[PDB]
Amino acid sequence: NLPFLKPDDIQYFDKLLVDVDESTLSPEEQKERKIMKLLLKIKNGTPPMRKAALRQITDKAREFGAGPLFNQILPLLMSPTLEDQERHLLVKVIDRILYKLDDLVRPYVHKILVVIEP
Amino acid sequence: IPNTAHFANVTQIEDAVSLWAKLKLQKASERWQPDTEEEYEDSSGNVVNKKTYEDLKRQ
Amino acid sequence: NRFTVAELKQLVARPDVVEMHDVTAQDPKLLVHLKATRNSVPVPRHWCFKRKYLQGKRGIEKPPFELPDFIKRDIDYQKLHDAFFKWQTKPKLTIHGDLYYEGKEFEGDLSDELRISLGMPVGPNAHKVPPPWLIAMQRYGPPPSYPNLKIPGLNSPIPPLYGDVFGTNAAE
Amino acid sequence: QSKYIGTGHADTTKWEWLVNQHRDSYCSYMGHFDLLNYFAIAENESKARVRFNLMEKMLQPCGPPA
Amino acid sequence: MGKDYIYAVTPLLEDALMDRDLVHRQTASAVVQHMSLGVYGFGCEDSLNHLLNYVWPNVFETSPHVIQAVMGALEGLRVAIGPCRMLQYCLQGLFHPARKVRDVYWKIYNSIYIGSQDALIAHYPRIYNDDKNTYIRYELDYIL
Amino acid sequence: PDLIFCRKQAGVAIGRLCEKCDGKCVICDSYVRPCTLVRICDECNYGSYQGRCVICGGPGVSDAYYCKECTIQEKDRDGCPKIVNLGSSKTDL
Amino acid sequence: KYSEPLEEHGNFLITVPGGSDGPSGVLICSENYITYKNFGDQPDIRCPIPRRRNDLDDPERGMIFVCSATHKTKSMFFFLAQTEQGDIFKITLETDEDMVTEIRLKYFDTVPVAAAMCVLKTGFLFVASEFGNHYLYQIAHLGDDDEEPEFSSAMPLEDTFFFQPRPLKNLVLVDELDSLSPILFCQIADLANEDTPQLYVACGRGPRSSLRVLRHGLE
Amino acid sequence: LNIGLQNGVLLRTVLDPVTGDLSDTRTGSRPVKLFRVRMQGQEAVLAMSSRSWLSYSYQSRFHLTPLSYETLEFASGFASEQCPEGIVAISTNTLRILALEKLGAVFNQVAFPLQYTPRKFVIHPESNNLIIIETDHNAYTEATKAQRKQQMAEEMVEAAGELAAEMAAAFLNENLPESIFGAPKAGNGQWASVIRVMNPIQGNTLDLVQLEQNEAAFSVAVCRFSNTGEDWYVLVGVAKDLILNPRSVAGGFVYTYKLVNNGEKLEFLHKTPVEEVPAAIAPFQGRVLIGVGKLLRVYDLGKKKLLRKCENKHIANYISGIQTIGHRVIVSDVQESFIWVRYKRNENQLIIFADDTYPRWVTTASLLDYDTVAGADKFGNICVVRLPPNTNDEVDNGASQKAEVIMNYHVGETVLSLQKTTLIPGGSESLVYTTLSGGIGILVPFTSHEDHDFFQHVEMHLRSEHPPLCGRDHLSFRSYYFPVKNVIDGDLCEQFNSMEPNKQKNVSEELDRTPPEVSKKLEDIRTRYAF
């Protein structure tokens, strides 16, 4: 019973809108991409329903893949549509991922250094 | 059994007798706390109650 | 699956304030012990009543709020504060634990008016003017219910009697 | 965590009430001064002794089903 | 300024606190709660007890908008009277058999617990010791 | 009409209020004799939250206080007195 | 960051000053056992409590330090720990600058029960009495490094080191703060020939307990 | 400038080009002479009168105390080699050069060592000798300590050596004082007790009576007996195996001594037993009213044991006190408040007349009036309560008739002794109370409603002007348990002399009085009720 969708979140809004079956036929660990839609639930949704996504990802970042996780988390906040509250939520999510993925954040150092610098 | 307030919610026989007995005049508020200790010896003996010392001093 | 109304009333050391509905709680001994407080105040009478303490006697017949004389007996300068803050009466109500029930509100000396209506004259200076009930006390004797009572003529001297006081109790 | 810790609710057991009673009655003993310099005169022990005793008693006092 | 004249207004609030209506109850409770806080520790606890005698039986009210008028009154009376008497009232029903009677007594106890947390410690009764545990707080019955 | 509050760790941030919601206390909701100043948590003054009313939730025009009948009752010693609930959450209109 | 159980319930917590001024670590003092534990690549070190020799109490009671203190020298940091009996031990420490090695204790003196001990500079130690008068003692001698038996934690045993209670040697009570607490009973009366009735107050605690006549006037 | 008249009256007034505010006081009934002295670097006024006084400013307080010495004829300030800063007083045919090191204080201490924790006194008006008790749990008696030392020596001699036998003999022959080694951890229930009888004139312990390693002591009294003669008889309490935490006592006893040696001895007459640890004793119209456990019993002179002349087992939880009114006994429970029972002599029955409402943990009590009795608590509070005016002593969950607390408030320490007495001859007697932290205190009643309103306004202003440095509100730290009533907090009402000058001026203008006038008004009470 989440709130309505938005055209600005069309980057990964094919989960609740289209038949994006990551468990039926898709690459390995494709459900983490749907976790980005869960990130939308953290942005678009209720406060408890939004914090539940972070509380779940805190115990799932180690079993999600550092490469795809970074490639899906960095561009999400790199876009100009990162609002103030959206920027705070993205920063908290990245901090939680780093606290979960400590050694995995090493290969992605070239990414955040190119994103967090500006 | 006397009509007491504690026996209000009671509705039985044996229980009524047990209440009239246990809730009777217990050790508290005894017979004025009798302690006479008559002068028949003046140095020992004090178990004489209010009636023992009276009979000891009368005769 | 719980102690009966008699087993839970005899095992306790103070069944004088035992309640039938209290024996069906989760901890009857604990409730009996808590109810045995020194000077606490129990639950009100509206615990089980389903009338709300207002629907039964809904026909109240009494004044809403009688004006107290502590304040009623430019508005006033030398008498307003001198009658409310000076001639004030202390409200004498319940002290500690008179919890409001459903209703809670519905449940040798003679007066001068009775002596004037009975036809008895006032007390003279030095004479004998007894009441008509004193002749039977002088004839039969003093009353055994009140031996310390004194009457003028029998036990009290005639010069005593002052105004409407036709007797005095002298406790020894 | 700190929602309502210190008191139960409608069906709180008597033991679980006395446990909170003692657990919050010793904190007024280890912290308050008159009720801590008064117990070290009766038991005839130092402040540290009585305080450590009261702290160790906070494990499960009142009679624990452990 | 209520401490100077509070006994002359006690019956006026008591008559309104009676079982008159459902809207004439919140007003008396609000008057009591706003007068207790104003006469806090000024020496007018007698009239406060007179009013509390009537304000207590009104606790049993199913009106969701009428409980707060009495809940606030109780929360003010706990902090302006001392738990030594409020808890004394609220102790008799702390384990009442009724499931809907403890729902209010435990709520009032919680409201009187967070306020004066350690102030009510020297206010509880002597819970006697059962054979299955050590309930009596014997560490406070010294003579020194 | 039961309003909720944040009730987090009261930081070192002072309170605020709107031009219409400046008098009443954030908890007592009364205009009678403000006693002490209200505060907020760390998530109450952060970026967009800088200088926001604790009752109206918009612009700040003054400092949020407590009522004298609400500070004597030790109500101010609770968490963040920010008026936020499921409806008055971060993602609100 | 760190979490480690303990063999005994530590009553106190003392910090071994870390950095250039010695290594860092905890200095817990449980019942009859002082355990120093520097978190990291440094094992713990336990040392029994050197109770008094030829005692008269229940031997099953492990004495715990009732207070603590410290000092800041160039490199010699001290710990004037007040045991439950009152024998202030100068519990020093020795290590290889990276891991603790031993904690040499010694019966420096024997003062009353220490509720507060301020071992400041200028040769002064504030022995606050748990009940009764307080003291401000001057540290005349060196305190440590004397002929007293240096009790450490490396010397094994099987039976704490029962050291005899030596008199006041490494300290001198420079001042005595007349603490009239804890008062146990009072009675106002003019028992003497003074027109102003004095106040006879029985105060103190056990051995330090006493009686005191307070006269309302300038001594 | 201060001028003392021929009598003890003396008036001092601040200096100015013309005369200013002046006050008066008696130091009296003798020639009130004045002299100048040099103390604390400043000047001071030495008043030679029936009681030699010294007045001077210190710590922003005009400290005016009496000199702890006999009166003299004249005085002067001597500052020489033998006395760099002292006073040379010329008495009757003598010149004494004396110096005092006291900077600021009201009471001078004369100490006397003791053995255990004292817990009671006794006034012997026949000889003016004090009879105190000492007791301590987990301790050793004198004979018990000697036997323990001998047993320890015998056990240590069971080694092989036998070369260290001399060392064991020396260890058993030495004597380490308790002040140097504290005291041994003498078991969990090993009790120690003793009774002392001394004279306050010196440290002369007129008599000492020890006890076994399990006998105890919790009460003492020195009363007479109508059955016996006028010979003063002492009655002391004793416990036996009164193990606390958990509370498990074994018995109690009452020792009756004849007060031998006219106050320097005591003949062990009778040891009356009891199944409960006694905790009080007092002459109730010529009888020993002992409260054992939860039963108050009036005993009389017993040749072999105290006879139970009367009894009443209507005590709530524990009778930890008793009072001696002319006709009623205001017993003080140890779990609830006081109960003012009546002892009908004609009926010879002790009936619990009226109890209280609040669960006051009574620790000390005192009949402040014929019916209004005050007392302390176990948490630190203090409450003075009285029964209603119309209460017939024949009528009677709670007693038939009930009373309510008049004035109760938090203090800060347990008031172990709240005695209604006059601390200085000249002012009305106030309630002087002790505390469990050494700080003595006084409670003075008002006399005029105007001064009461002034003090109330001053306290209400200072409660918002000067905030407590702890952080908590004033009423929270003054009514921490019970709301204050008719008791202005003098601890904060007089703490305005050390405030900001602007705040002082504001508080003075708000009170409609000058800051100096406000200080004079605040000090007038302390001068008319204290030293």
Curated annotation (Swiss-Prot), chain A:
The modification N6-acetyllysine is found at residues 92, 100. Component of the 17S U2 SnRNP complex of the spliceosome, a large ribonucleoprotein complex that removes introns from transcribed pre-mRNAs. The 17S U2 SnRNP complex (1) directly participates in early spliceosome assembly and (2) mediates recognition of the intron branch site during pre-mRNA splicing by promoting the selection of the pre-mRNA branch-site adenosine, the nucleophile for the first step of splicing. HEAT repeats lie at residues 67-106. It comes from the Eukaryota. The record marks 7 as: Interaction with RNA. Component of the 17S U2 SnRNP complex, a ribonucleoprotein complex that contains small nuclear RNA (snRNA) U2 and a number of specific proteins. Part of the SF3B subcomplex of the 17S U2 SnRNP complex. SF3B associates with the splicing subcomplex SF3A and a 12S RNA unit to form the U2 small nuclear ribonucleoproteins complex (U2 snRNP). Within the SF3B complex, interacts directly (via HEAT domain) with SF3B3, SF3B5, SF3B6 and (via HEAT domain) with PHF5A. The SF3B subcomplex interacts with U2AF2. Identified in the spliceosome C complex. Residues 85-88 are annotated as: Interaction with PHF5A. Residues 67-106 are annotated as: Interaction with SF3B14. This is Splicing factor 3B subunit 1. It is found in: Nucleus; Nucleus speckle. The modification Phosphoserine is found at residue 26. Belongs to the SF3B1 family. Coiled coil: none annotated. Phosphorylated. Phosphorylation occurs concomitantly with the splicing catalytic steps.
Swiss-Prot record, chain C:
There is a cross-link at residue 35 (Glycyl lysine isopeptide (Lys-Gly) (interchain with G-Cter in SUMO2)). Changing residue 52 to A: Moderately diminished formation of omega-N monomethylarginine but greatly reduced formation of symmetrical dimethylarginine. Methylation at Arg-51 by PRMT9 is required for the interaction with SMN1. Changing residue 51 to K: Abolishes interaction with SMN1; Abolishes methylation by PRMT9. Abolishes formation of omega-N monomethylarginine and formation of symmetrical dimethylarginine. It is found in: Nucleus; Nucleus speckle. The modification Omega-N-methylarginine is found at residues 51, 58. The modification Symmetric dimethylarginine is found at residue 51. Changing residue 45 to K: Does not affect methylation by PRMT9. It comes from the Eukaryota. Changing residue 73 to K: Does not affect methylation by PRMT9. It is linked to Craniofacial microsomia 1: A form of craniofacial microsomia, a disorder characterized by a spectrum of craniofacial malformations ranging from isolated microtia with or without aural atresia to underdevelopment of the mandible, maxilla, orbit, facial soft tissue, and/or facial nerve. CFM1 is an autosomal dominant form characterized by mandibular hypoplasia, microtia, facial and preauricular skin tags, epibulbar dermoids, and lateral oral clefts. Affected individuals also present skeletal and cardiac abnormalities. This is Splicing factor 3B subunit 2. It comes from Homo sapiens (Human). The lineage of its organism: Eukaryota, Metazoa, Chordata, Craniata, Vertebrata. The gene is SF3B2.
UniProtKB/Swiss-Prot annotation, chain F:
Residues 74-77 are annotated as: Interaction with SF3B3. Zn(2+) 2 binds at residues 18, 21, 53, 56. It is found in: Nucleus; Nucleus speckle. Disulfide bonds: none annotated. Zn(2+) 1 binds at residues 6, 41, 44, 80. GO terms for cellular component: nuclear matrix; nuclear speck; nucleoplasm; nucleus; precatalytic spliceosome; spliceosomal complex; U12-type spliceosomal complex; U2 snRNP. The modification Phosphoserine is found at residue 89. Residues 30-46 are annotated as: Interaction with SF3B1 and SF3B3. The record marks 12 as: Interaction with SF3B3. This is PHD finger-like domain-containing protein 5A. It comes from Homo sapiens. The chain holds residues 6 to 98 of 110 of the full protein.
Curated annotation (Swiss-Prot), chain H:
The record marks 245 as: Interaction with SF3B5. The record marks 317, 485 as: Interaction with SF3B1. It is found in: Nucleus. Residues 357-378 are annotated as: Interaction with SF3B1. The modification Phosphothreonine is found at residue 514. Residues 414-437 are annotated as: Interaction with SF3B5. The core of the protein consists of three beta-propeller domains. Component of the 17S U2 SnRNP complex of the spliceosome, a large ribonucleoprotein complex that removes introns from transcribed pre-mRNAs. The 17S U2 SnRNP complex (1) directly participates in early spliceosome assembly and (2) mediates recognition of the intron branch site during pre-mRNA splicing by promoting the selection of the pre-mRNA branch-site adenosine, the nucleophile for the first step of splicing. Belongs to the RSE1 family. This is Splicing factor 3B subunit 3. It comes from Homo sapiens.
